[model samples]
Target: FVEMVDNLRGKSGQGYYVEMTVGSPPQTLNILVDTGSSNFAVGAAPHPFLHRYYQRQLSSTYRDLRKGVYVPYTQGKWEGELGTDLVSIPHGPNVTVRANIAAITESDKFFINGSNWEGILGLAYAEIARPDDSLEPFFDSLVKQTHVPNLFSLQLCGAASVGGSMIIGGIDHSLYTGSLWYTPIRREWYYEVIIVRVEINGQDLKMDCKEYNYDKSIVDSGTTNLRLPKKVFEAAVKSIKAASSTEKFPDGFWLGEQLVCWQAGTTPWNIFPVISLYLMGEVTNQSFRITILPQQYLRPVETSQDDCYKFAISQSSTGTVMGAVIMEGFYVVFDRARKRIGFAVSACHVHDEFRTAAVEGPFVTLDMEDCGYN
Candidate 1:
């Protein structure tokens, strides 16, 4: 059975919040979680949109610290103040943990969009958000002040889904059911893995392709789609065409034909190739499941006068995240305490189960092209 939710909500309208220690000794504030970008920030006033979404709770510890901070993004900006307060997570009723927090005073560039989130919990490397002497990440500050490692873990249920948990300080054993696979972080903060080889239908094809770099592969849970380099994408297309008896679609590979419609007559193609990521002199075995739509799976997009394919097998240009699609059957634990990421295989399921049932529509369809494959 798959876990489902009605809608995904965030603190201050962003997907994350924080708990902090404030005032004379300590106080707690629940904040939002944002891994897509860095900078753990909170709400500020004078913005009608934020006030409408977040019901303000009065507290003596709430202090306007906007004069000390500034945050900028591709869309807008955020300015806030920093203060120490107790932060909490409702583990079960009275169960909670408190940490230091930062309060926002003024925000001009930061505003909530239609995603229904509150605040952000930043997970990028230090380069993304630089902290001055006066301010630092709530987790970073905790780790520095306490002389102990500050760990962060997320139990992301799905888009618009709830009941997921994000725990700071340490991980919750119950949330994960099996062993952990630890992958080394690149000299840069990204999860870099060495691609030993890539195969399609039991054939090794990495050497035949150009622009294939083993060190370029990364594992990011914050992104939703798989991005392959041009060579990898072309290799995939060739493999699928070779495996299918019918013609390939003109626009690109369609999902229904490769995943669903192929069952009508032809044998279902096994494109779920074992994609291996090597690190620490050990190999982590993972399979890349193909989810193509009928229209066109590969489209040409221009990047700097070059007609590069839009979908490459690397980190996405839109965002540096490895979205839920690649994370389906893997038990990933982000250990901020140890500054390492752990991965393990689980009872993997197809993407179809996670998607909503297709609504009834017209039966209009098209003919399959002849690829001349036996």
Candidate 2:
């Protein structure tokens, strides 16, 4: 049960990709590492945007399960054939476990233009697995065969040269500093957690904690932005505007419909306040706050002009989706064995030789319980 670490390539905004070899002959393909979904799906047919497809017929060991998989996402959907194949990670787990592989024959918006990945490796629990929960997921299959610990962690090197690392079977203590503060996984579907409250620049928003998790709250690595429910999003924006610098910003800036550009080397970090979320800790009555500095929420935009930045937080129809913008601030551990998630400062979360974000407090628990409205 040794731990394996895979160096993630590509940016958090453009979905992190990990190289894996599948089938008997073992064709190497870049697969998107998505913790939000539970389908080890790969492109099996010709697509204009994809560089290549996984030719199932070439693998003598490939076995078609004859099951149809129709997985859909917020922006895309895919139809594919379910099958079984020997899968090996070139840079990750050593064991080549026989696992279910969704060979996608048709998709829409799932394979976008200029995307480098040809497949998606879903790491979520099997309950959300397409077709049915009876199918074992990739991680589950690996753990069952290799007897590895049922735990994995992620470290997204936000604005660094290299993407980050995804550790399978165990935690990489070196990737983080200090002790990891863990919050119980309220539910197992999407690594769901209980968010008790939110603070803008240390000032509590003073809204009902239940509103924070209106429909749901999840930590999803595949999503690009830190999306909040509409009401909470508006309140958070209002707090930011009140606490921010007197400098004028365009109407579209806060709306996320426009971009604000600056000189090549300068930034507007001082113009915004830090955003923090208080999560229910391991103890029911205790909680901790994960704070994202202005540098984290204000994302840079590639434009014809000099350096441009945009408000990376947005409104979500389904409560809060703590996407890459928030996950990049800390090394997150999905300790499924204990039904909890851990967060710690990541080694690569450095900017101008300083930590860009932080975690603070295991303060007294909030007065209210049942904040999970979803």
Candidate 3:
């Protein structure tokens, strides 16, 4: 698959952004890159989005769709006017897509949060496409018109200010090592994946294997932290706290709903807990293990009074949500046409930084676990 590359404007922990155009002079603005939502929206002047706004008169190739659009989301939703605009990335291929852009009428304060990205460009399929018409996604439009394929890969680096990449229409071999581990998607609306098992540290939580039934759970890069099942969340926290007895929190680990932060010291990296997610492998007849390390989960919280480490938060959710925090170390591929997801060890991270295929890919050799894959 041939590749089209774009440098994201944001860093590791923050949301991802890409360049796009709307009006004349091809005035490019940075927008958030989201896979969980399907609303290609731009922020209005009402909200402080680095003072970026879409001016129809300024763009020579603007065509207002004349439809009022509203997108209902997690907390609430945003509304605007639907229109066809000349949306082109600075480095886009062939004829740029005339994407369905939302010129916002009203927006929530939560939309800004001090981001350089003035808007969001959702990459998921049309099932979640928003603003009333279920408009085809920007990438989808590009794929249909141009020579672009139905594949995109995310390599959100952990480095400071180095930024990241979104390889449109193909994969980037340099971003990840070994072959990609492909898992069939149970659904297509969202970039969902199946997990047959989850292990904290090295011990398997034998809490009825059927509890996590390989459902269509979201693996969103938009989210900052991982959300486990309510039952699994509690078990995970308790297990982590138990294991942290010796290298425990100094100023009492306050177990809050959002996060659990405690006074920090020489980071107990030696005994840091590791979590592994076992995704289904149909061909290998085993579970594909996706490992997450303490370096990824442990976030150092510093203040005037105390320095603390905030581990992964546990929340009450019907399904599992593996967000950016757990995904930073691994190269993730969102394959649209194949209806599957692929994973590989990222070159940006440490540990097994591209060694053997069996150790890194896990696409070929599956674990001999008794979770029914065999």
Candidate 4:
């Protein structure tokens, strides 16, 4: 059976979040659903940016594990004490689990103002869990303590006005359409996958697959942009410039430093090229493309002009981060049991009655038995 929870609320900038009940007395807090890391942390003390926190003093069942927990993200860091308490997703699976909770006492730049989430639910694996790998993540505890399958799915609406859904334990067939194409989970740490190549308006970059996965490539819900390694990013930028009508843009625009504006009714969407990410498939030894139209990458800035927009793709030194910019295009399933990730065209990948995403074939086979971590 699948645990359906549809109250996930938030947009691309604030990050998608959902409400979950933690502790014995059940302190319900909005949690940021992050697939980039594996630490289930919450605000235990009063924070300037937070509205409320998890008071351990109020829960009789809360037991401090006496373990020091510290996790650092791309934007912030948190220090906390590890503890175990009865936790449940009020709108998710009906069962409760004795879950590890990082009661964060201090933090930096994590809980930003105007953001609705008070905690973070890291949906990745225990391999990257804080303190040590022995510390099981919340989802692992849930699967072990309950009868749910070892799989979960996510749908992020991005700039769409509607909120997305996160299906726990099993796939909700109704949430997506078309054939569900799957790619191998190259590594267990970050739901990592291999990108065979990249296409800008159906024109391939014509580089080796290794260039696409230079350092590493992973699908991360926590990240805000479709990050590319320095080399790949440069190539992509050049290709996009050549393909689009606009020959020049502010240097800051390509660096995601500033927004470009047009007349109130004019749009730059018509000038941008579609981005297609070619991902290697599991077992098939073939590739498939997940394409995102111009609107998905050229996000509008919330200004009076309504025509101001920011480039959604950014440069990353580490590797490709298929974040909200790419993820909002599909309904993603993390099938841990099978060591693969599934993608289907998202039901919400539509705007003003126009479809905004596309998916292609199981072709383009190249020897990739050793494409992932060794």
What tens digits encode model 2's per-residue C-alpha lDDT throughout 138-223? 98898889877899899887552347788877888888887789988877777778789899878999989888988888889888
**CA deviation > 4 Å runs, candidate 1:** 1-32, 46-57, 63-84, 92-113, 131-135, 144-149, 159-163, 167-178, 188-221, 229-320, 337-339, 346-374
**TM-scores of all predicted structures:** 0.56, 0.95, 0.85, 0.95
Better of 1 and 4 by lDDT: 4
Model 4, span 46-129: residue lDDT tens: 887888899999999999998899899877899999999998877677788899999999998888886778999999988889
**Model 4: clashing residue pairs?**
none
Our tally of clashes for model 4 stands at 0
**Where is the poorest 10-residue window by lDDT in model 2?**
347-356
Residue 343 lDDT, candidate 1, scale 0-100: 54
- In model 3, the clashing pairs are 23-59, 24-59
lDDT of 3 at 269: 55
* Candidate number with the higher lDDT (1 or 2): 2
lDDT comparing candidate 4 with the true structure: 0.83
TM-score of 1: 0.56
